[model samples]
Target: TFQGYNCYSSALGEYAKQKNIDQVENIILSQWSFFFDEEQFYKNQWYTGAADGPVDVVLNEDLRNFANIEVLEHISSESQAIDEGRKVLEKHGLQIVLMDFYYMNSFNWKSLSRFNVTREHDPAFAVLTQINENSVHIIDPYYHHEENMSMEDFIKSRNSMTKQGKISFNSYEIFSNGTKKSNIKELLYYRFNRYLQEKMFGKITQFGQVVKKQLDNKDRKWAFTGYNCLNSVVYQHQNLINLQKKFSLEMPPNLQELLDNWALIRKKLFEYYSRGSYNTEEISNLICKVASSEEQFAQEVLKVL
Candidate 1:
């Protein structure tokens, strides 16, 4: 549903009919709304374009080969966009991979906490599988939960799990934490946290180089220039731990091993955080290291399970 109301399709059909082009090759279609029809759009000679409202068309190999779609709707609500986008891609015979709401306000403590539990228990959970592949990687270190679960579901599950002693903290405890000491204040905090997380993540991703340059100019010299290598690892670990406890699930063996070996990972990440030395190159290397380790752990867990 990331493509807008088939406007591109309508426009393309008209253009093709006027121009007398028999076939358009490598057409890319992009849109903004959460609902879009890819097959209809492409079949009608439409291709994806910028989210600033589809102004140009790419026909050449270079443009078509490296075509990218920036669905604003996707950034705003990744779960809905990705789920719908996948369906459209599947129907159209296009191989598609989505870079999910990385660096976006899609992470919620409640949601992250929930995912931590569910992932530990549900081996066949599709979302965990997606994350494992790095297709749905976390881009930012901050927390937000809009994509994790609906608010109603979060409240219900949170209460029920607490009642069953599946979750560590009760609703009162969660709402009365240091950062949020009142019921209304806690709700507001949750909302604002999600908003800020989304905003920061979006800014980082959307204006990567520009933001880096700006951050470099600021007095907090080492904070924003380098890749956030350490925080990324910490975020993932926290996510995993919270997930394990929330679902009343036993930790996977490999994750257990990770907990046992926590000192090493913690030390490494702390060094990375303090040094702030991971540029793009080092970041990529670190990502590979973590991915390979996690993949191996997943394989071992699968074997045991």
Candidate 2:
């Protein structure tokens, strides 16, 4: 699945494969962002606006230029959005959208009495295969399952989640037959190198609001922006290291050590946040250390690149 806890990647990977894109995993790994801002880190802030950054920019332009594909449009939670979404699904065969599992269970409310369904506000990415006036068919890659729900329930469920009218569907536009022109290895490296120069380390900065929520004690979720940001670092590092082995690219010597450090930080942060007993001061100190170390590691990556 190549998802590895990243549901966006999971759903997008499915979309890429359905379009017959070669080296899809390479494309996914290439878009990984590892840059971290020292200031944001010290302030215990991380950005999640770009839904984790690199991929959005990578999708809008990097992938557009590399593969001639882009998100041509989006669907919101407006009154008639479902009909519009259904039309797109009918025409394109599928549509990538976000789903709130808790409300989506309305699809099986009757049979669900067999077990107590735990209420969870899990807003995740999934693909819609069929949508009609009465029902919608969904493929949830993260949950490894597919299900059907009534259009009435779907609309009500979605409206509750997006009370203020936010985007819910991102429709991909395929300009080519999924043919990529550049060498995958070089392309991957180029994307990685380019991300290093962006502000807030590219998408990493988007998580700033998410991190601030954590410090404010508003978002105590185990996997908030702070944890996800670190996870990106670890995820990107491992992917790059594996790519280096496959292509024998010039990789920094301290790469593995940095990955280990970040992985541990991710683990510790998750543990602390999950338990909801962590001290903000300690968390801030730890994040600041990561901020400093990330700068050092970023410089090393530049030297090798």
Candidate 3:
């Protein structure tokens, strides 16, 4: 029940609480990607392999890391996965996983929300609780919306619009728990660095690839990746800057200055896209030139981690 569109994490956290996972509260304080078990990159393409950069989530592996018990592991189909989730909840307790399916009914939804269940390609994840044979309880990560609808109806929507194997874990690994360390300096240097190195560094590298050039126009990963990756970094580093002010933390001058420069670059990059700035090949080349600088700067940031 926070805010904005993050039903993927919200639903999972809510379900963990409902199931009385003792670790859930503590885990909630931890970053969402602490146990992330999916490889998010497509090897040669600027696209994500599991589902998408926004078109994604294979949350089961990470959920399994924290769950006391689980009934389903990795059922692929959307409705079938829900079916499995329901059965697991009925027989055992709770189920968590990724979902991508259209809904039979439509709301006046946002155009690009990942939780827009109306879109076939956009993906969101959730958890299952309140088990029953006639209906399944959906704890989705949007609007704190918990739904109960018939399995028959859910299956129908999925049948009409679900057919792809969009799960991959080619880059998952176990990580250390640094919860016991309390020193601010120690936590910042070691624990934070560990997370940056393990979970986030790959995504930053992927952003470099996605924004560099128009590699494929057929699938349109470029537009999604540009918006999702580039815009998000710009927004998040601003969050980092805000957090520094709120918490009285000082970033090293070099990294701090680089972020200031990158923030402005990202803002301009967004403006260019907003106005259809790449109508010509030269503009495309300019975009790539900007991204090359971003990627190079990203490599430099990696050295500190």
Candidate 4:
């Protein structure tokens, strides 16, 4: 059974908004059978208010039934809600197989980052997925601690450690009736370090390019244009730059120019970004004019083609 709020209507609204469609041909298309029932709708036990008490479902066999319950205690910092929900599940002869509990505090960054799960104050989302035939895997959606690290680093580290016999097979082979738990700390550490390395190397490379480009474009209007353009380019391609730098790839020189003239470019860029209807073509022409005025800088602008 599906258990959650805003699962149906909200999803439908979002889909409609994205598609720019006035009407939803089929609500079932947006409906999650496990989460929402057409006839029952908000009456489902999963909703905050249900007349027939909370709706609970038994999965698998009659002897081995499981109830997937989620507790949204986001408003108040209390464990009583979860305890109460668990008690209700047990009272109904349903095994509390999986329980998701979270709080909704505005000040909590962890919750904010995983806001899709519940409230902004709730803890990060924990995902339990079936891996292969025999194994069940528990993963923290917020697995990577470093902002710079890619998901591949975490997977690579886990694989490498397992291959070197450093990681416990029992933990990795949970499906084989293994009692051990996966080393979440090791995985997080590996990912964090990888991210740190990527970030550090990226800064170094960026700094180097800025220094080199500044040297090359010194006293040139093209350098000025490069400086102005870098701000806009970096703003647009911030994520791409971070990714390329992570892999030790060279960034475009135009990006470096923006970085060089960040202070000046930022002021103007923000003026444009905030003011709708500003003449972008005029601003662009001014950049070209500045670049073309200097002989050395003129060559640089020509090379950008």
State which candidate has the highest lDDT. 2
Per-residue alpha-carbon lDDT of candidate 3 for residues 72-189, written as tens digits (9 for 90 to 100): 3343454355555556666656565444535522223345323423244434444556656777665554445567868775444333423334542111111234223233333234
Comparing candidate 1 with candidate 2, which one achieves the higher lDDT?
Answer: 2
The lDDT values for all models are 0.28, 0.57, 0.41, 0.27
User: What order do you get sorting by TM-score, best first?
Assistant: 2, 3, 1, 4
Best by TM-score: 2
Task: Report the poorest 10 consecutive residues by lDDT, candidate 2.
Answer: 46-55
Q: After superposition, how far is residue 237 of candidate 3 from its true place, in Å?
A: 6.0
RMSD of 1: 23.6
**Better candidate by TM-score, 2 or 3:** 2
Off by over 4 Å in 1: 1-230, 256-292, 303-305
* lDDT, candidate 4, at 242: 45
lDDT of 1 at 239: 42
lDDT of 2 by residue, 1-100 (tens): 3443256666777776776656555676656454444454444444332234323444456656676655554546456677777677677777777665
TM-score of 3: 0.51
